[PDB]
Amino acid sequence: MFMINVLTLIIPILLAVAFLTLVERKVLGYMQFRKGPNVVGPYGLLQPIADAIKLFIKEPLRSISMFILAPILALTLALTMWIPLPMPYPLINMNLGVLFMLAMSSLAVYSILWSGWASNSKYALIGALRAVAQTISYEVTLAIILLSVLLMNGSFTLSTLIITQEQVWLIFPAWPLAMMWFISTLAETNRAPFDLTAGPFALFFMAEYANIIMMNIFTTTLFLGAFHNPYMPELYTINFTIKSLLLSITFLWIRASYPRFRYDQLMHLLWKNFLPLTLALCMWHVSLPILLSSIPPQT
Amino acid sequence: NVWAKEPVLVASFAIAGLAVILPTLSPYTKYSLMINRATPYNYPVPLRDDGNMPDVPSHPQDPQGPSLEWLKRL
Amino acid sequence: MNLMITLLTNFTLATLLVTIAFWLPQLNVYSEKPFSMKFFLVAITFLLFDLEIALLLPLPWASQTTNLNTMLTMALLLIFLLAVSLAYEWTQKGLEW
Amino acid sequence: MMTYIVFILSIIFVMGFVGFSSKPSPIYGGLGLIVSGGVGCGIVLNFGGSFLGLMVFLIYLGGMMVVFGYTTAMATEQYPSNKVVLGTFITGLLMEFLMVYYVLKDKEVEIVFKFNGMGDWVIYDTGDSGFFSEEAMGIAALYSYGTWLVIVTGWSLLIGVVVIMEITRGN
Amino acid sequence: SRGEYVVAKLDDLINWARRSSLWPMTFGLACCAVEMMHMAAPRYDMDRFGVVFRASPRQSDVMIVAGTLTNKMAPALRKVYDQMPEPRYVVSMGSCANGGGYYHYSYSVVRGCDRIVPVDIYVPGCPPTAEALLYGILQLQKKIKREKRLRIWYRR
Amino acid sequence: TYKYVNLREPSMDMKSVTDRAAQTLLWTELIRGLGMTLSYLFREPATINYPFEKGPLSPRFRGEHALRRYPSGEERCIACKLCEAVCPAQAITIEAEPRADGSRRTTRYDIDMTKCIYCGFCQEACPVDAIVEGPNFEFSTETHEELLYNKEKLLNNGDKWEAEIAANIQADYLYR
Amino acid sequence: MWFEVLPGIAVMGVCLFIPGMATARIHRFSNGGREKRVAHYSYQWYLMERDRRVSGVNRYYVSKGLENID
Ligand code: SF4
Numbered sequence A: 001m002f003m004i005n006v007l008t009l010i011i012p013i014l015l016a017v018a019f020l021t022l023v024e025r026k027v028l029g030y031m032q033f034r035k036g037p038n039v040v041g042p043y044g045l046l047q048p049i050a051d052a053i054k055l056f057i058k059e060p061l062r063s064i065s066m067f068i069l070a071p072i073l074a075l076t077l078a079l080t081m082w083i084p085l086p087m088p089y090p091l092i093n094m095n096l097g098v099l100f101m102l103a104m105s106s107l108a109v110y111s112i113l114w115s116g117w118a119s120n121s122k123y124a125l126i127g128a129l130r131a132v133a134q135t136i137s138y139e140v141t142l143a144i145i146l147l148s149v150l151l152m153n154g155s156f157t158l159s160t161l162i163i164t165q166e167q168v169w170l171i172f173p174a175w176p177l178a179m180m181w182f183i184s185t186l187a188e189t190n191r192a193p194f195d196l197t198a199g200p201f202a203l204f205f206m207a208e209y210a211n212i213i214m215m216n217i218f219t220t221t222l223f224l225g226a227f228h229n230p231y232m233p234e235l236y237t238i239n240f241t242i243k244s245l246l247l248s249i250t251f252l253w254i255r256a257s258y259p260r261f262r263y264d265q266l267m268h269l270l271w272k273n274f275l276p277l278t279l280a281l282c283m284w285h286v287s288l289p290i291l292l293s294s295i296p297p298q299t
Numbered sequence B: 001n002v003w004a005k006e007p008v009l010v011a012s013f014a015i016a017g018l019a020v021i022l023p024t025l026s027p028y029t030k031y032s033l034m035i036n037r038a039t040p041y042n043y044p045v046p047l048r049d050d051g052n053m054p055d056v057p058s059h060p061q062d063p064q065g066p067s068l069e070w071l072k073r074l
Numbered sequence C: 001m002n003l004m005i006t007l008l009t010n011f012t013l014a015t016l017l018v019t020i021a022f023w024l025p026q027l028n029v030y031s032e033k034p035f036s037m038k039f040f041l042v043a044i045t046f047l048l049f050d051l052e053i054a055l056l057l058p059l060p061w062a063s064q065t066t067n068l069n070t071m072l073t074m075a076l077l078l079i080f081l082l083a084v085s086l087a088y089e090w091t092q093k094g095l096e097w
Numbered sequence D: 001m002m003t004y005i006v007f008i009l010s011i012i013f014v015m016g017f018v019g020f021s022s023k024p025s026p027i028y029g030g031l032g033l034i035v036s037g038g039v040g041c042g043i044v045l046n047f048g049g050s051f052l053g054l055m056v057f058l059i060y061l062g063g064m065m066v067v068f069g070y071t072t073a074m075a076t077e078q079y080p081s082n083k084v085v086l087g088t089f090i091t092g093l094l095m096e097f098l099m100v101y102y103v104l105k106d107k108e109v110e111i112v113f114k115f116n117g118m119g120d121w122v123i124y125d126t127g128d129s130g131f132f133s134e135e136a137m138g139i140a141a142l143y144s145y146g147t148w149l150v151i152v153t154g155w156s157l158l159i160g161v162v163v164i165m166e167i168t169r170g171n
Numbered sequence E: 001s002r003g004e005y006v007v008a009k010l011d012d013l014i015n016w017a018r019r020s021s022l023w024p025m026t027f028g029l030a031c032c033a034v035e036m037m038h039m040a041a042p043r044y045d046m047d048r049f050g051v052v053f054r055a056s057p058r059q060s061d062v063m064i065v066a067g068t069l070t071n072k073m074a075p076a077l078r079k080v081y082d083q084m085p086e087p088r089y090v091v092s093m094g095s096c097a098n099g100g101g102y103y104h105y106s107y108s109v110v111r112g113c114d115r116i117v118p119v120d121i122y123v124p125g126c127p128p129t130a131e132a133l134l135y136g137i138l139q140l141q142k143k144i145k146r147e148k149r150l151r152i153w154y155r156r
Numbered sequence F: 001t002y003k004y005v006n007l008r009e010p011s012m013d014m015k016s017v018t019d020r021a022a023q024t025l026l027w028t029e030l031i032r033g034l035g036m037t038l039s040y041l042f043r044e045p046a047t048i049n050y051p052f053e054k055g056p057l058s059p060r061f062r063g064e065h066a067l068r069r070y071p072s073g074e075e076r077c078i079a080c081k082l083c084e085a086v087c088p089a090q091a092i093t094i095e096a097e098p099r100a101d102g103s104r105r106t107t108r109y110d111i112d113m114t115k116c117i118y119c120g121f122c123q124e125a126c127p128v129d130a131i132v133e134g135p136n137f138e139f140s141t142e143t144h145e146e147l148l149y150n151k152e153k154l155l156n157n158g159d160k161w162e163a164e165i166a167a168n169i170q171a172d173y174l175y176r
Numbered sequence G: 001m002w003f004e005v006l007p008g009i010a011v012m013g014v015c016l017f018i019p020g021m022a023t024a025r026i027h028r029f030s031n032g033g034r035e036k037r038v039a040h041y042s043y044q045w046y047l048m049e050r051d052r053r054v055s056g057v058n059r060y061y062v063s064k065g066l067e068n069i070d
């Protein structure tokens, strides 16, 4: 039954990412004055399916072992990185899972650098080196902010987190920390306004958008949600899914609106605006439970 | 002054200074120490009777020893 | 070993996706035809802040002990030293463009 | 798929170390060392291992090979094999197969030691009432006990930062 | 017979998947590029048909040559043309592109774009209306509908 | 008469500077931008469904390059070569012979739809309105041979619709 | 209008709803209806091993309630 659990996880990742692409394209269309796409079939579903098919039948051409090894790592992260996400009963009860999130984000940085090395000595690989540098400049911020938002939760176990979110949401004790972390999720997804940047393009594209859905599900679990009532977990599943959907639409909706940074403005902004503010909010979150006598039950 | 120059720096040093100084004012750090000391993990060991102590209550129901009552009274 | 089974299934299915991406089209039709310094400062900067993150991050497991004063003291000392390193490169105009 | 799963992952670990200590091109060496770090993480998590092994995996794989491949890609080229590299791989593979031979077909292997090569479930605890870990309160020291050590550690790292900027053109 | 039935339905499926979206790369030198941008307009959507503007050459489905080709432009034109996936189709938009047009009797102007690449759709006009270009793209889709590729592979 | 801009200083009153500081450290006008984009989200799109709903046009659109003929009569053309005399791309090619009846006519009448820039000078230069810019827009031809219209192509083209062209001309013989 | 974007949202939300429902039903379906005993500590694993030992079925969830009192 355990391989059946694995198949019920990683068969809807294909449908999830493909229908995510139609959802984001339709949503951008209605953000503008566009009905795109609706002509190709009933409300545009066979258009992403058959378009994925056409992308698989492109017949491209060509170091070969490196070109093999990069997108296989990207998509095996995209598969193996929905394991401890506690849609009510998670797949593996990891004692620590958030540090596993950080480690596999670093593996995504490996993937980008291997693709840039496989790109065979190009001004594109210099740009991809810069993209590796900007992507690696974010796991400091994400780990430190994640450390502070678990500090009010005691353990790394994330079931304790779903215990903590019953009374009020955790968005209220840490809202600006959450704001900086959500900007870091925009940062880690390598999309707008944080840009730029051959095949197999379907597998690489799949890796990026499964990484997006992972970051949005983890955002939804980390800060808000509903209550885990046993012997009817589907209620929590539905409410969690609705909130994660609204957050992902908001995520693409913020992508729909602003021009993208300058690279040096991005570094300048990152260090000289997030990084002291992270440290200051984090030391305040350290000294907070000793001044409220509320340290969480680290069991 | 510097409030327009680097305002996030000013707010950062402000919350940092209160995070440093602010543990000097608390009626709650003693509560933190009592909570984090009086949580049993290991086994509460027994010991030999004949030290003739006017303490160390022989019954766990017996409140003759030092215990907690401010817990349930918040 | 359950997670090893998951890793094995995901790795094998992803390799089958890559081989569907490559060795599927049977229609074999027609075969046809300097670096900078400021890139390097960012990596070592990340590296040293990551090391001090590794020093910081076992903080919440430690939160249940008696010596609270020394904990708060050395924790504030660690974040203060990290911010001092940041302010040192900030005031010595290091990471600038 | 047997008792010796820790031993097999140790064999693949030695394979990875021989794979980059056979002196390849350095980005292939970084690939092999990523393989080595992953399987060493597997070994320590087999000993459980829940905290520290996957912990420093972030620092080792999550912080070092990225910077090594970064500097390797940007600095020099080796842009498009030699018998010495594959010969070192031959000698490492042969000594590995010789160790497998003398472990599995004999009693003990002694270089200058006494290795009893058998089922290494020994040594292990008889299921005591730990209820946290060993690693939990283990690394949840350094703060109620570690006065001197983390002070000199952070001081050394701050000096490391100022050393790096000086060498790369302080100020 | 049943193998013929299978090859016919499979060929129709893959040709349908090809004619589904067809995102081009917008090459676009002169004012016909402005009219390509105006058939990216809200009042005429490319995105209703799966057609996406995307200057990535390595995922270009078809290619729209629109504008006035010159002698200095043509080598880079075919160098862009050859770094493209092998199922490729060319839409020549514009009087300049499909036969030289107003700058025909002149040096430094290639007489159309037959002299560089094979051309599949000619849509004339100066500029061709977005209306007319979109009629041309629909006729391109029906050209893709009539292709019988895998049937010719089966009776090969 | 001028209006030069960027005349405001950042006001050193505490109200304005704390409003700009709260703007900086609370991310306000970014949310205002999201509000404007949502205001265009919930509108209704101006997308005509193209192959059914064809777009609006004018009575004076310039399309087909058709020819015309007289009411119950032969070709309106005379072959007096004014359209080749004015054709700025020199796309018109006329070779003219009279028939045995005595009236002057043609042999060959070629339009380079490649070279055709679609001015309307041949419409606005023919003295009898023989060649007329058509109403439509669909040429869309696969082969470079087939966009070189001959005289019989134009006759079978202009005889494909008369009442369209005559309706447009009757609507439009006074502004020109 | 955006009445038409709602089927794509709904279908992709069905695709997000399915793995948690499948996981929860498989846990409640292949463990005798009892929830799968989450265990993080060696105390609880020792307790679970003696639980599956004293049941005799070699299944920890059978739970053999209040019968071996005599
Ligand atoms: S055909 Fe006309 S509109 Fe197009 S590029 Fe030439 S001059 Fe411009």
Ligand code: SF4
Pocket (backbone or CB within 6 Å): F076, F077, F078, F079, F080, F081, F082, F083, F084, F094, F125, F126, F127, F128, F129, F130, F131
């Ligand atoms: S179409 Fe008109 S202008 Fe041209 S040759 Fe004929 S009569 Fe003269």
Ligand code: SF4
Pocket (backbone or CB within 6 Å): F083, F086, F087, F088, F089, F090, F091, F092, F111, F115, F116, F117, F118, F119, F120, F121, F122, F123
């Ligand atoms: S519209 Fe202009 S280029 Fe075209 S045939 Fe008439 S005069 Fe010549």
